[PDB]
Amino acid sequence: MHPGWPDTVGPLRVPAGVVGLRPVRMRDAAAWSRIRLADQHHLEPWEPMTGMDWKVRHAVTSWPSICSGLRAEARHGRMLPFVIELDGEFVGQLTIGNVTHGALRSAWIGYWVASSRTGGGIATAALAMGLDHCFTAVQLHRIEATVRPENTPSRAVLAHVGFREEGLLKRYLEVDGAWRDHLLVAITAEELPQSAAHRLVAAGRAEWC
Ligand SMILES: CC(=O)SCCNC(=O)CCNC(=O)[C@H](O)C(C)(C)COP(=O)(O)OP(=O)(O)OC[C@H]1O[C@@H](n2cnc3c(N)ncnc32)[C@H](O)[C@@H]1OP(=O)(O)O
Incomplete structure (x- = not known):
């Protein structure tokens, strides 16, 4: 029904510190709200529009309904909603979405990291270990992502993890006040001679931990 969920993933060491993944939970409300509120202008240009004011969307009281919905999707096997931890503390999210099995065995992957912790290899490590989890525990064949060319x-x-560009999706997602083109990138399990974590370690971007 939902292989590889729930689970913890990692850890991996990067310059910023020790990175792991673990499920969203109700007590994340305070840290999720504090960081998303403070990071509004770093996140809003790159996030799907919600049709809500940013500050009402990200109040502490908004989290239980969001967290509940994510976990409901996860127990139906359609999503894996992870929190990125740095040294055991909430610093962002890594979400695997639109999970299918059958003859497709594919999903998309998305992420964000608190701006004060960026440039330390966290998102790269989160993505690598998320991919490795999808290609083992979740029994997936393919992971895609969409990202604005900008x-x-x-x-x-x-690019650190080895994603290939596959296409350009015109006017794909409502972002920052307009329908914006997004590149489509992808990677499949048979493209990994080595795990993505192992690739990071060999490139000097992470260390075993
Ligand atoms: C598939 C998707 O989810 S698309 C949407 C991704 N999420 C967002 O854009 C939300 C807002 N931004 C963020 O959350 C973060 O800034 C992220 C997720 C984009 C990056 O998080 P980080 O922890 O800093 O990533 P990490 O350190 O692993 O790699 C970032 C790399 O981009 C480099 N970089 C940063 N800014 C720039 C830039 N303007 N031009 C070129 N490279 C840049 C960084 O130096 C780093 O590479 P390097 O180590 O070789 O120098």
Whole structure:
């Protein structure tokens, strides 16, 4: 029904510290709200529009309903909603979405990291260990991601792990007040001679931990 969920993933050491993944939970409300509120202008240009004011969307009281919905999707096997931890503390999220099995065995992957912790290899490590989990525990064959061509930092993260560009999706997602083109990138399990974590370690971008 939902292989590889729930689970913890990692840890991996990067310059910023020790990175792991674990399920969203109700007590994340305080840290999720504090960081998303404080990071509004770093996140809003790169996030799907919600049709809500940013500050009402990200109040502490908004989290239980969001967390409940994510876990409901997860127990139906359609999502894996992880929190990125740095040294045991909430610093972002890594979400595997639109999970299918059958003859497709594919999903998309998305992420964000608190701006004060960026440039330390966290998103790259989160993505690598998320991918490795999908290609083992979740029994998936393929992971895709969509990213605005303008989102040069996220494209760097995806390139670190080996994603291939597959297409350009015109007017794909409502972001920052308009329908924006998104690149489509992908990677399949048979493209990994080595795990994504192992690839990071060999490149000097992470260490075993
Ligand atoms: C598939 C998706 O989810 S698309 C949306 C991704 N999420 C967002 O854009 C939300 C807002 N931004 C963020 O959350 C973060 O800034 C992220 C997720 C993009 C990056 O998180 P980080 O922890 O800093 O990533 P990490 O350190 O592993 O790699 C970032 C790399 O991009 C580099 N980089 C940063 N800014 C730029 C830039 N303007 N141009 C080129 N490279 C850049 C960084 O230096 C780093 O590469 P390096 O170590 O070789 O120098």
